[PDB]
Design a protein around this ligand. Structure first.
Ligand SMILES: OC[C@H]1NC[C@@H](O)[C@@H]1O
Ligand SMILES: OC[C@H]1NC[C@@H](O)[C@@H]1O
Lengths: 804, 804
């Protein structure tokens, strides 16, 4: 249909049709009589997979020949979403498949909707890694994603009477046609045991052996015929493991790759972490030996560590080079530091892993020895650089004293890596000034920034084809792999035909999403209202509560002056809470409770709707973001390391209400502050407040509108049958608010009125939109990856094709 | 190469080659560079599978149209062996594939050897069901095998210092290309719960739901284009089943289809049994409704129950018809009796399932109620037929008193079935006279015989192509689906060219197997010796111990007169012992212990070898039976219900040494007693001995040669480092021998001398062989199945093709 999807020729369409029939017939073992839409989805998925694998074989063939420096991206989270459309777009098969399935009496869009989201990630970190794989392939890097094939992803979220219910994600129930099991490349991973010393170094012995089975998923670049590999590890018990009981207990080892953790210091967590690290490192070493001399290892291998999760890669690499390959400490260490780099994804104190010594002792005794020995040599470097600074010595130690003895894994990461980066400028500055100040003063050259990005493939071409077409009409298709080219849309801010087109696309997207809400969730929304959307994980730092306070203000204002005009709004909030995070679960209930009162008040009518979006995930993100008018990015300054949803919204025609936090600062810098709704405390202001002490009572005393809301919550206004249901929320807001919701309330409400004012003038809104879209180029993951490649890994990106 | 495999044409071979490459490329995701022989095996297996599925679809399509009476064969054992060659032969693809793989630089025979045996059965019962599926498809019956997809089969047997070690059978490690998972046809199976009564009948409530997932395996008929289905059930936990623990405990439900039991009254056993029954019955009912009126059910459905294992099918069918479909008792019962039939496979007291009431109460409360109610109505039938016979009432009851209360499942089987059969004439007679006398006197018309059979496809054409070719040269190919035609070989017993050919085939088979022993197991055997082979499960009734006593006699005779001529022999014994069957495990050790002494005695030389065959299984049976001269079938009279190995040997050119037990009686009747080495007690003689009382001491007192052997065993002759190792064996032989080994010793040794005498005259041996092969026609499973079809199920077999 459109230009951004490819050619629907004569030979391709005819050839696709007979491969569809072949897979339905031979692969699926069905005919037209018993074939359900799911079988049709599988037949198409298998047919498209055929074109991937041909390119996949050639790519790995190619890397064998050229022998380039290999990048290893290690994450415990790969938040992939659906694969079919992404695959069709990157291979230029979308129109051929659409025409081909049409000629068969099939709707392709109906088929796409049957694919389950890969349950392989939680949130930002996981989606980031997905965007990166896409970018890495698009830029011709010989890169590998490595992680765990969780049998059950992050839970599916169901709402029952306003409460989050968790239910298992059986995304694999019907099979995954994209993955290829590789049982022939299975690998031992060791646990417990003991250390023995011999005239010939240390030996790890009497170990429980868990086997690690790899599944491979192809990762297609954008129209460059490069197809990289994402390799995911599954746990499988060994074969010599009454007789019936020995076979049943094989389940115990296989529990490692069973569930993604929604930092909780459980053993199973540590085991997952070592599991992915150990198998991955064996694979990396094996691949390098098919190039003896580990001097060249850093020129052939780059390993990127994402948060403290794969931190054990450092002692593990040491263990292999020292105990097994017989290299001297100093040489092994030189190789480890040059190979590894460390990205920090968030400063949240409750996410920087600190393991108890008594646990590493039991589970990985040799690793503890290596850590102690790393710590010792590192501390002599500190001692010699800062003579007499004993407090620095204990601050910088990898070992923490007091209560239980712990190993700070972030400190390990810094010591054993040649580069350390944060994920947006302000965040990387914060690392340098606060939590890693000591390490920065010792090695200022390790510390870099790499502002996060999103892929324009999924996050524009795939999810918003309408917008993608009108851009291409004016400036052509080159922007898809070079998003900076969107600057050229600046010369169109005054063009009347373009203003109308941007506004029409937005309204089409809104109408569409409005109709999805009704069909699948029977809830009725006004499509000409302002689509006010906050979508991300539920957490107090993200301050869904601040949004809640605004929604109630608008409602109270409508009740006070009902016959006075207000810009209508649909307020949408979606996100999962962590299962044991009580406050987050209460917030969800608060939101749905506000909906119950507001959506059923006749005096309000269709002027305010509060909708909770159930089971927020990648594929729901692809539907809601194109339809949004207002992006809520309202974390307390200094808490959101970057964010990436914000970039998704910028790129899709939403204006942003936000604090100067994470990437917001750089988004506002790129579009100009005038084109951005910035409100609230900067980082400096939060610090000043922290010094004097935060007293929420003061805000309750001076702001009558806020006082009313607190009273309403306390007295059961939003919970008539359980008057004191939100007592924990009120009590937290009043006495124990770490994120200072009340302090940003006034300026947030004031900013919101300005958002409303501007929306009454559609023409000016849309011009402001154009200025955002036109300046979103910096936020491409192509740009991010290009920077990692040049400043960290030491490989040159490439835009060159591989033969078809 | 040969005529019995098909045409290797021009279009087929060319077309097979590009499908081989397609699966290697696209299915396997490999190229010539990384492709191991296993990948080549998988590429061929996938290519041949393509031709199956085309016929598979049409067959089920066909049955939908014609709507024939459907046969359901229920077994907890399906002992399938390898599938590739069987598949090639039945489709007539063997020569096309051989030529096709040759043109690619591949040896097909090398590839065949990479396929693992389906770990889905234990022994006779399991192999019987396999032969039957083959026969049912060959004879055009709309039949379905139903059972459990055990994740780990029967253990693999390893010998370590003469002892059986059990190790898990991970036959699925690399995947099974023959099966098709069907997640879309998953089914609930209920456990525990309670019964509630309502104005509207009984209700089963508060049940644990285990889900039952079906895997389908195609079952090709012989060159008739019929392809039936074998459906196997896998356990999978439900979706609403801290949060981490709820996901891990999903393993508990999935333990149902985890391991085949090597009758042990465990709960997990009962659960497996109910599991297969419940899901199977739901499937049967569903299929019948796509024909309201359950009067026609018996005309559309036949269910065959194999031993007491699927006995719960009877109360389960009642439960569905009464509680769910709302039929009256009497009508439901009429339907159940007409649908079900029961085969008994062995009279072994320790294999007739008797479950404790307290267990059925807990696990299946409604089923217990239905059983009690069945028992009540059945006992009124007994009371009215035999007025005043109270002991008959308690003998015939489904409920047993004393100690723990038990349900006799065999009694249930008889009451709720319209036919009951044994598996060889003598065995069916025994059922009528002894263990089911009471039931026979009440309903003489239920009781039938159906002598077991083997398939000539696997057990001649597949395993012995050499013999298959020389037969076809003289009489053509028609015998493969009509084995009675072997009678025509009678007119050849005096033909000189045929005598030589039979003898040459045998020697080729022997040379071949001799060379397999050396390569894979480095053990050196004389190929001109008499190949004396006893292969079957190790059990005292099978009397491997009697064979052992002969081997030691021969050895002692050689030591006494070393320079006297004896017909050289290789004595081969193979078989698995049940893990907790102590005596059987000791017997194995005894056999290997005899080997240690005998194979290393210089004075013996290559005149006697004792080899234990490790890990006896279907594919080893396919190698050893063609190579055998002497078939040991030496169970105590009245203990072997039929046997089937015996028929395998008869058909492959071995003479038989045996007791008049099971099918031996009918084999001797068909070939004439003169052409058979019958020895020992008949059934009548065992009875007479049982009456007087068995005193083994008496035989030890009168037979000096036997006395010597006992002394040797006791004094540590075969166990020098552990003198008293075989004390349990001696002690059992002497005081607690239930199978009367000593009583058959003299006549067994005497018979063995006659076997030896005849072997010195090769020409007469081979003529006697011809007379056996020529009369083995009755033992075809085609004949057996034809009889089940006509006398039990009420369907007419057919030899007609389906379109190609
Ligand atoms: O770096 C991935 C994510 N970590 C926390 C967010 O601020 C950031 O986008
Ligand atoms: O009927 C299957 C098997 N049960 C015991 C054996 O005698 C018989 O072949």
């Amino acid at each position: 249909q459109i230009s951004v999807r490819g050619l629907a020729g004569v030979e391709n369409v005819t050839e696709l049709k007979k491969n569809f029939n072949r897979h339905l017939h031979f692969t699926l073992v069905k005919d037209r009589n018993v074939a359900t839409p799911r079988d049709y989805y599988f037949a198409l998925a298998h047919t498209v997979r055929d074109h991937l694998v041909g390119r996949w074989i050639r790519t790995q063939q190619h890397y064998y020949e050229k022998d380039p420096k290999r990048i290893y991206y290690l994450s415990l989270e790969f938040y992939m979403g659906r694969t079919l459309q992404n695959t069709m777009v990157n291979l230029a098969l979308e129109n051929a498949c659409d025409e081909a399935t049409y000629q068969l009496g099939l709707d392709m869009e109906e088929l796409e909707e049957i694919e389950e989201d890969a349950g392989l990630g939680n949130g930002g970190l996981g989606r980031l890694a997905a965007c990166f794989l896409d970018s890495m392939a698009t830029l011709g890097l010989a890169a590998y994603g490595y992680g765990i094939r969780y049998e059950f992803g992050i839970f599916n979220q169901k709402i029952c009477g306003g409460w989050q219910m968790e239910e298992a994600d059986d995304w694999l129930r019907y099979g995954n046609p994209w993955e290829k099991a590789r049982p022939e490349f299975t690998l031992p991973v060791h646990f417990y045991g003991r250390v023995e010393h011999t005239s010939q170094g240390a030996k790890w012995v009497d170990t429980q052996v868990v086997l690690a089975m790899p599944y491979d998923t192809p990762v297609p670049g954008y129209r460059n015929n490069v197809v990289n590999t994402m390799r995911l590890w599954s746990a499988k018990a060994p074969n010599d493991f009454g007789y019936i009981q020995a076979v049943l207990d094989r389940n115990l080892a296989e529990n490692i790759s069973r569930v993604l953790y929604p930092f909780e210091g459980k053993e199973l967590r540590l085991k997952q972490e070592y599991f992915v690290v150990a198998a991955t490192l064996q694979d990396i070493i094996r691949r390098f030996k098919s190039s003896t001399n580990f001097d060249a290892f850093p020129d052939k291998v780059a390993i990127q560590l994402n948060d403290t999760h794969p931190s054990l890669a450092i002692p593990e690499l040491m263990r292999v080079l020292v105990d097994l390959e017989r290299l001297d400490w100093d040489k092994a260490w030189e190789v480890t530091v040059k190979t590894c780099a460390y990205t920090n994804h968030t400063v949240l104190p409750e996410a920087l892993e600190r393991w108890p010594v008594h646990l590493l002792e039991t589970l990985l005794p040799r690793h503890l020895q290596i850590i102690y020995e790393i710590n010792q040599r590192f501390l002599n470097r500190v001692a010699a650089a800062f003579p007499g600074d004993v407090d620095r010595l204990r601050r910088m130690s990898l070992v923490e004293e007091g209560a239980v003895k712990r190993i700070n894994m972030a400190h390990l990461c810094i010591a054993g890596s040649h580069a350390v980066n944060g994920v947006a400028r302000i965040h990387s500055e914060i690392l340098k000034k606060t939590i890693f100040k000591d390490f920065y003063e010792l090695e200022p050259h390790k510390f870099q920034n790499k502002t996060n990005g999103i892929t324009p493939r999924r996050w524009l071409v795939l999810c918003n084809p309408g917008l993608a077409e009108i851009i291409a009409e004016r400036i052509g298709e080159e922007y898809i792999s070079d998003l900076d080219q969107l600057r050229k849309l600046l010369s169109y801010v005054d063009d009347e035909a373009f203003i109308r087109d941007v506004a029409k696309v937005k309204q089409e997207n809104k109408l569409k999403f409005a109709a999805y809400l009704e069909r699948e969730y029977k809830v009725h929304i006004n499509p000409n209202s302002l689509f006010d959307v906050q979508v991300k994980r539920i957490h107090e730092y993200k301050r869904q509560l601040l949004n809640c306070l605004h929604v109630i203000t608008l409602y109270n204002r409508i009740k006070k002056e009902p016959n006075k005009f207000v810009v209508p709004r649909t307020v949408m909030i979606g996100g999962k809470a962590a299962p044991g995070y009580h406050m987050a679960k209460m917030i969800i209930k608060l939101i749905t409770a506000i909906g119950d009162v507001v959506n059923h008040d006749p005096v309000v009518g269709d002027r305010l709707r509060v909708i909770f979006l159930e089971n927020y995930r990648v594929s729901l993100a692809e539907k809601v973001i194109p339809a949004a008018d207002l992006s809520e990015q309202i974390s307390t300054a200094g808490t959101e390391a970057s964010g990436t949803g914000n970039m998704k919204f910028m790129l899709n025609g939403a204006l942003t209400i936000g604090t100067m936090d994470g990437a917001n600062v750089e988004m506002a810098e790129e579009a100009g502050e005038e084109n951005f709704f910035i409100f609230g405390m900067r980082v400096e202001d939060v610090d000043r407040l922290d010094q004097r002490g935060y007293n929420a009572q003061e805000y309750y005393d001076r702001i009558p509108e806020l006082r009313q809301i607190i009273e309403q919550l306390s007295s059961g206004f939003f919970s008539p049958k359980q008057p004191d249901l939100f007592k924990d929320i009120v009590n937290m807001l009043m006495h124990h608010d770490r994120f200072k919701v009340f302090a940003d309330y006034e300026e947030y409400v004031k900013c919101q009125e300005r958002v409303s004012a501007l929306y009454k003038n559609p023409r000016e809104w849309t011009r402001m939109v154009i200025r955002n879209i036109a300046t979103s180029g910096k936020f491409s993951s192509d740009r991010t990856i290009a920077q990692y490649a040049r400043e960290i890994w030491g490989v040159e990106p490439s835009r060159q094709r591989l033969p078809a």
